[PDB]
């Protein structure tokens, strides 16, 4: 437990062993859980010294201790990561990826993951310095099972950080170069590797449908569905996020998700005790019911309409908002028979109950769904039965009250409903 002044004195001697002992003391200081003095180390001007120690190939202990200290600094705030980058760390760490000592190259992998995970500019700067080739060369083995578990986990985490941010998305060539290794990791039997691979895939599918397509042409959708059915929440959460992202794309990409059997997992996801799982599953469902009529029919055939009724009836309010979206998308794109089936499953009462929520968008969504169901009833000539059913559930007075809402869209929708069917 040295002081920062003693560390500085040790570093500023011209003595390689004294420097090594000071750097180790700095590593131990920066490794404590109780408020490590990162800012004091930075203000003392130590980062350039650590970076120059990264290149002392004759003294691998000081390479290791410097890499560890710098990794700890790069794990802090954006200002601290920037101080590491501004000391010249990025190319020095990329050079260290070639070290024959696994603990040293692992430390460089970790450091580059922290720098890249700071944000899209540093991720792109790490890519521009050429990290991807040596990172992938570390995984160029026929069977991933021959690598050390912790080493493989660190590489997967760092690779997922190179995929992470969105404004801008990572360069296409970088994604293309990383994707085969990412798919390998997505098939590797280690829960942490699986979780981090899934997160990477979820990042790469969040965006325009072209990015989704380049993910789905690798054939990962069946493995995502398999992981969707896992028992570990850290795996299910990113797998579900990735599936949800894919079903925001074209109808063919959504169909790839359906053909893999995703819908059979959804009864448990839509009843999962973890509210975030229920919310994301309902969001995914809402994007599937925004699809073609045969895809709505697949939702119906899997028995999922009663689960949508249930989550609309009782759930966290955000999950209920997602369920309202699912119902409006269903009623907008569904056949008359599908809409009749939805009403037969009991959607009217939970819709009316939610009409009392304070959120303006959910009210607009519910009114749009009611209008769509009324249009289906018109096509069937049963508008009066629908009006009676809505009144019996206490929705008539709610719409009557809403026709004097502060919002113009609510105004017009409720007024049109009252004037046309009531």
């Amino acid at each position: 437990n040295w002081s920062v002044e003693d560390i500085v004195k040790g570093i500023n001697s011209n003595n390689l062993e004294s420097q090594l002992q000071a750097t180790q003391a700095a590593r131990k200081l920066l490794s404590r859980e109780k408020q490590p003095p990162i800012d004091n180390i930075i203000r003392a001007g130590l980062i350039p010294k650590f970076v120059s120690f990264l290149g002392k190939t004759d003294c691998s202990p000081i390479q290791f201790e410097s890499a560890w200290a710098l990794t700890n600094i790069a794990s802090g705030t954006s200002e601290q990561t920037k101080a590491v980058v501004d000391g010249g760390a990025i190319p020095a760490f990329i050079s260290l990826l070639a070290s024959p000592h696994a603990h040293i190259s692992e430390q460089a992998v970790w450091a580059l993951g922290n720098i890249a995970g700071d944000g899209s500019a540093f991720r792109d700067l790490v890519i521009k310095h050429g990290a991807i080739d040596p990172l992938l060369a570390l995984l160029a083995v026929p069977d991933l099972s021959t690598l050390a578990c912790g080493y493989l986990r660190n590489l997967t985490w760092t690779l997922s950080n190179l995929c992470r941010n969105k404004n801008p998305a990572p360069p296409l060539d970088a994604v293309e170069q990383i994707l085969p290794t990412l798919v390998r990791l997505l098939h590797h039997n280690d829960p942490e590797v699986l979780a981090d691979s899934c997160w990477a895939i979820s990042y790469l599918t969040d965006g325009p449908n072209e990015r989704i397509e380049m993910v789905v042409k690798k054939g990962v959708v069946p493995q995502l569905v398999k992981l969707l059915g896992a028992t570990e929440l850290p795996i299910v959460t990113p797998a579900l996020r990735a599936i949800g992202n894919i079903v925001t794309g074209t109808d063919e990409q959504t169909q790839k998700v359906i053909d893999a059997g995703a819908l059979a997992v959804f009864p448990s996801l839509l009843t999962n005790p973890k509210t975030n799982i229920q919310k994301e599953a309902t969001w995914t469902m809402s994007n599937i019911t925004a699809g073609r009529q045969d895809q709505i029919q697949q939702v119906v055939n899997h028995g999922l309409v009663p689960f949508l009724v249930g989550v609309l009836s009782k759930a966290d309010f955000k999950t209920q908002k997602e369920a309202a979206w699912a119902i409006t998308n269903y009623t907008s794109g569904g056949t008359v028979e599908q809409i009749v089936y939805l009403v037969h499953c009991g959607i009217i009462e939970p819709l009316m109950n939610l009409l009392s929520a304070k959120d303006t968008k959910i009210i607009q969504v519910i009114l749009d769904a009611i209008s769509n169901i009324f249009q289906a009833a018109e096509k069937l000539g049963e508008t009066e039965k629908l009006s009676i059913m809505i009144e019996e559930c206490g929705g008539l007075d709610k719409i009557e009250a809403l026709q004097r809402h502060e919002n113009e869209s609510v105004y017009k929708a409720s007024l049109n409903l009252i004037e046309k069917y009531f």
Partner: peptide
């Protein structure tokens, strides 16, 4: 187009932004 991508619901999100060693 009734499909809603991410950032149309909630926020960007994610996990494991940075990791310290602490070994």
């Amino acid at each position: 187009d009734n499909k809603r991508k991410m950032d149309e619901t909630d926020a960007s999100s994610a996990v494991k932004v940075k990791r310290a060693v602490q070994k």
